[PDB]
Amino acid sequence: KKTPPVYPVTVPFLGHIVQFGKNPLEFMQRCKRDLKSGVFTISIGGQRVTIVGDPHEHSRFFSPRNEILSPREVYTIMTPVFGEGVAYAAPYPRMREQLNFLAEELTIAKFQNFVPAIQHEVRKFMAENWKEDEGVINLLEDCGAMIINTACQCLFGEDLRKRLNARHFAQLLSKMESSLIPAAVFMLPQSARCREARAELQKILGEIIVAREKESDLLGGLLKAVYRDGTRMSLHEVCGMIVAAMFAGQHTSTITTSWSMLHLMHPKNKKWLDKLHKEIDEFPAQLNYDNVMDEMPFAERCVRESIRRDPPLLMVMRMVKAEVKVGSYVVPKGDIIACSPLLSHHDEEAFPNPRLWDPERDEKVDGAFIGFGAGVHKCIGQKFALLQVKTILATAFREYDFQLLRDEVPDPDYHTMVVGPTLNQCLVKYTRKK
Ligand code: HEM
Numbered sequence: 282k283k284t285p286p287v288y289p290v291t292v293p294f295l296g297h298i299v300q301f302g303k304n305p306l307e308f309m310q311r312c313k314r315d316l317k318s319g320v321f322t323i324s325i326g327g328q329r330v331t332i333v334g335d336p337h338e339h340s341r342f343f344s345p346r347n348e349i350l351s352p353r354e355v356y357t358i359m360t361p362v363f364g365e366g367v368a369y370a371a372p373y374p375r376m377r378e379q380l381n382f383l384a385e386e387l388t389i390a391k392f393q394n395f396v397p398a399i400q401h402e403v404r405k406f407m408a409e410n411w412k413e414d415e416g417v418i419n420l421l422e423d424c425g426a427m428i429i430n431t432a433c434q435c436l437f438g439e440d441l442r443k444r445l446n447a448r449h450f451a452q453l454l455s456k457m458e459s460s461l462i463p464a465a466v467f468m469l470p471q472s473a474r475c476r477e478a479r480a481e482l483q484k485i486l487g488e489i490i491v492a493r494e495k496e497s498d499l500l501g502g503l504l505k506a507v508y509r510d511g512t513r514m515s516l517h518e519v520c521g522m523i524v525a526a527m528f529a530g531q532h533t534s535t536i537t538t539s540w541s542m543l544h545l546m547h548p549k550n551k552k553w554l555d556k557l558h559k560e561i562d563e564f565p566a567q568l569n570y571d572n573v574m575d576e577m578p579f580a581e582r583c584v585r586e587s588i589r590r591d592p593p594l595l596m597v598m599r600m601v602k603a604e605v606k607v608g609s610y611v612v613p614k615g616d617i618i619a620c621s622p623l624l625s626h627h628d629e630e631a632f633p634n635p636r637l638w639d640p641e642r643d644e645k646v647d648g649a650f651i652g653f654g655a656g657v658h659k660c661i662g663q664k665f666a667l668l669q670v671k672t673i674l675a676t677a678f679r680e681y682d683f684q685l686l687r688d689e690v691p692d693p694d695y696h697t698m699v700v701g702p703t704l705n706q707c708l709v710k711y712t713r714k715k
């Protein structure tokens with residue numbers, strides 16, 4: 282009549298903290314089987330963390346509006362990176378405007394100059410960093426830029442990038458994130474050390490609008506935005522949404538792209554690689570949007586299966602404000618309710634052989650895949666990242682072949698906020714192709 286089962290903890294203060302850390306997948310795979318339930322409640326620090334790990338129930342986590350399931354108090358962490366009154370740090374109704382504000386820029390209105398834009402960008406890095414017909418790549422780090430390069434290129438305006446190069450906008454981002462550290466979702470020089478990089482970027486920004494006025498891109502659209510009460514976003518409000526737009530893209534999509542390339546370059550998986558080829562071969566250098574979008578479905582599957590196997594975002598969380606029932610269990614207001622792409626995508630009814638990479642697999646429980654989340658919190662970056670990644674792939678597997686130094690694919694380093702493949706494992710020997 283109330284609640285789902287709880288897991289053993291040997292010593293309380295710790296809870297499950299290192300048991301999670303070592304391997305969150307193993308740990309969760311264990312708990313689920315051992316607790317004979319897809320829905321179960323673990324504990325961090327005498328804080329209650331009840332996971333939603335049975336796929337059929339995802340509706341229960343992703344469907345309810347923020348009041349009933351509220352994300353803010355979980356993501357409070359980002360407030361300094363995003364700003365104090367933005368995204369979650371903003372109140373929800375006003376936040377919704379921000380999401381649609383952002384959404385009206387990733388609107389497929391502006392996607393028409395993107396493809397030819399990121400493509401050219403992929404080459405510019407390749408011809409300048411991939412120089413020889415014999416190759417070195419730390420693909421994870423090389424995709425890190427190729428991603429942040431093409432994106433800035435796509436969303437940063439000509440007058441914007443000159444001032445703030447792609448190469449070193451990363452530098453600000455990767456000085457903002459360093460603020461964000463482990464073990465904070467359930468519990469300063471850097472507050473400053475990061476505030477500085479944000480106040481920096483911000484003035485770098487407010488100094489561009491003056492040149493904008495006394496005289497269009499993500500920023501362009503963002504300033505032309507007026508709220509419900511006919512307000513316009515303050516300097517530092519807009520500043521954050523750019524940060525947030527770009528933070529969200531950089532790692533996920535880098536990882537997604539790397540994880541992606543890896544499986545395809547692998548000898549294990551090379552009927553796919555040549556199925557990619559039967560797909561992208563008759564396509565020319567001239568990449569138009571119809572090509573990526575209308576005529577790249579197989580390649581899309583790969584990227585999706587990449588994200589399926591190893592979701593870059595292991596957990597997503599709400600603070601249970603009202604109390605919500607899930608299957609036959611009930612989640613008590615005061616609990617943190619979580620839902621995990623990582624665990625869910627390894628349910629075997631949903632995804633048989635879940636560590637196997639099969640682009641041409643389909644979810645056998647409708648809704649299982651939650652890589653881009655679901656319900657009232659569906660990712661708004663999805664079609665864009667999907668378009669970045671697809672085009673990067675096409676361009677690269679275009680004129681090239683790839684080899685992995687290793688006998689099999691890198692291990693998911695679960696030792697970060699946003700999980701991608703291992704760093705020291707991700708080296709790849711490139712050779713040129715015609
Ligand atoms: C490419 C890999 C990506 C993955 C796997 C991903 C995954 C997700 C997930 C799971 C959520 C919501 C889940 C939760 O709140 O717990 C989400 C939300 C969001 N994503 Fe993404 N995302 C990706 C790329 C992007 C990109 C490229 C953008 C922007 C260009 C973006 C912008 C957002 C935004 C704005 C939200 C807010 C949704 C909300 O909380 O209401 N994401 N993403």
Ligand SMILES: CC(C)c1ccc(NC(=O)O[C@H](Cn2ccnc2)c2ccc(Cl)cc2)cc1
Pocket residue numbers: 355356358359368369379380381383521522525526529530533594660662
């Ligand atoms: C500007 C406004 C609409 C806006 C509001 C919210 C977000 N949220 C957001 O980016 O979520 C990222 C994860 N993510 C990565 C890819 N897609 C999503 C995130 C990571 C870690 C924590 Cl703790 C919380 C959130 C983005 C823009």
